[PDB]
Design an enzyme around this catalytic site. Structure first.
Site, short mmCIF file in Angstrom:
data_model
loop_
_atom_site.label_atom_id
_atom_site.label_comp_id
_atom_site.label_asym_id
_atom_site.label_seq_id
_atom_site.Cartn_x
_atom_site.Cartn_y
_atom_site.Cartn_z
N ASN B 188 0.82 -1.23 0.00
CA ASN B 188 0.00 0.00 0.00
C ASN B 188 0.86 1.28 0.00
OD1 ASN B 188 -1.94 -1.76 2.46
ND2 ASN B 188 -2.45 -1.62 0.28
N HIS B 190 3.14 2.18 2.12
CA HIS B 190 3.41 2.66 3.48
C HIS B 190 4.69 1.98 3.96
CE1 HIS B 190 -0.26 4.86 4.63
NE2 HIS B 190 -0.77 4.21 3.58
N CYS B 225 6.21 7.11 9.48
CA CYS B 225 7.22 7.83 8.70
C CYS B 225 6.69 7.77 7.26
CB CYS B 225 8.60 7.18 8.81
SG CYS B 225 9.83 7.79 7.61
#
Ligand SMILES: Nc1ccc2c(c1)S(=O)(=O)C=C2
Ligand SMILES: Nc1ccc2c(c1)S(=O)(=O)C=C2
Lengths: 264, 266
Positions: B188, B190, B225
């Site tokens: 995704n 991330h 992050c």
């Protein structure tokens, strides 16, 4: 995994993992490259080891000079991919390791790879040609007739790569290895350099294209405390790029390469 | 891999790979953490889930599970070529969230070589706002959990539930300018949770890593992050050797994680 009937090649199946895939839910080229490395390691173990007593006596090791990968279809998350690998002596120059990737369910070739390896002294880092004595110890583990993953008389696996000229079209600066990028001997894993090369490709290209071919030359190693800059310039339906990895400070070349991408 | 007979837990075997091991020829804590994540994903798929463990109710309200805390204890790291068996299960923790536990065993001896526990909370995927679980959503997952407590860390008031303080400047050790590359991202886009474990460990001196083995790691997750963020990793010895850790954004110093590690002499 196992050696085939003739004992001249090795096959292994892998189920693609959740953390091994990218945005398309298919294995990244770095997962593929790690699997190639793993099947190569398992092949050496199955034949008795990839250094003989003679290489160990003279402090010699095999090091990669060039890696060339072509992917037609990246296996999806949960799919089973079968990889076959073999080695061939290339006279006194060095050795070549080839791979064939197949979908386990259909049996169709979904990828292929080839790599050039040379002998190097572990301590001085000095390259040398293969002596008759060392070469003859490994011949019993290779097919004697040529067997090439890239047979074509004008294949892109043997193309010469030029040096990227400044200014680069794109760049990713200050790249550093972390402990996960190191192998069991505290050296940077060869697959990390593939990742670093790809970091300077714009995200828009990655989002709309699929990587079809990557050729990478290895000139010098990145040490654990080195810092790398990744440089890319478009050279081109398809998009082609020229790549350069160099040390952030003095600009010493560590790798050069080319990538070929096709529209999704 | 497969669900056990009662369908309340999932087991899977893994052969440790050449690139998965460190200088000791045993699996790194990051390889272990990736295997925990993989067996968790396979468990969700086996019980009917097509995103991660989201039911149609969660999907309609744009809710996802996010990790609040991860706690891992390793007695023996499996060697290269060894087969490790991992068993995982989930339990509801009332309205707070859910807990996923794991047990690692050597497949040849059957002995427990490690254990892990993690706290998960519900969050809106768009606004990033935390929320209580509510009856309707919790009741849809209860049929996949053991009803009686089953804990990887039973001990009353053990290391897995200890509060972690915030590291005070100046830090004893640091590793600055850490950035994720595409290999650190999940499907995704991330940052993978295991990358934060690696970043925490980057500020431990090489001499400690060369002479000690990591026995325990507890990590709290406060903020994510982003792909274009830069992280600083901070460590101070609090002691075996024990350390306090802090990951914060390189610029404004916004906290992303805090943790503790416990190391044993080799
Ligand atoms: N140099 C060389 C030649 C063949 C073979 C190997 C090394 S191996 O040991 O990796 C498997 C076959
Ligand atoms: N929330 C939740 C509870 C139990 C279970 C899961 C999610 S799962 O889908 O991972 C398998 C069991």
């Amino acid at each position: 995994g196992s050696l085939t009937e003739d004992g001249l090649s090795y096959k292994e199946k892998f189920v693609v993992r959740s953390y091994e895939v990218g945005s398309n839910k298919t294995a990244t080229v770095e997962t593929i490259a790690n699997l190639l490395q793993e099947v190569g390691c398992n092949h050496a173990q199955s034949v008795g080891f990839a250094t003989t007593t003679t290489m160990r006596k003279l402090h010699l090791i095999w090091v990669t000079a060039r890696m060339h990968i072509e992917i037609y279809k990246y296996p999806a998350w949960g799919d089973v991919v079968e990889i076959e690998t073999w080695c061939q002596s290339e006279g006194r120059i060095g050795t070549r390791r080839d791979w064939i990737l197949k979908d386990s369910v259909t049996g169709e070739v979904t990828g292929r790879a080839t790599s050039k390896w040379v002998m190097m002294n572990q301590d001085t880092r000095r390259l040398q040609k293969v002596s008759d004595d060392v070469r003859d110890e490994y011949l019993v583990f290779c097919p004697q007739e040529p067997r090439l993953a890239f047979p074509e008389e004008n294949n892109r696996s043997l193309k010469k790569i030029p040096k990227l000229e400044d200014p680069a079209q794109y760049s990713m600066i200050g790249l550093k290895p972390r402990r996960a990028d190191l192998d069991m001997n505290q050296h940077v894993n060869n697959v990390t350099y593939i990742g670093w090369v790809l970091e300077s490709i714009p995200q828009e290209i990655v989002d709309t294209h699929e990587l079809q071919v990557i050729t990478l030359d290895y000139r010098r190693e990145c040490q654990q405390d080195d810092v790398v800059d990744s440089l890319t310039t478009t050279t081109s339906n398809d998009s082609q790029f020229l790549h350069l990895l160099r040390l952030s400070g003095d600009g010493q070349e560590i790798n050069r390469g080319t990538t070929l991408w096709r529209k999704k």
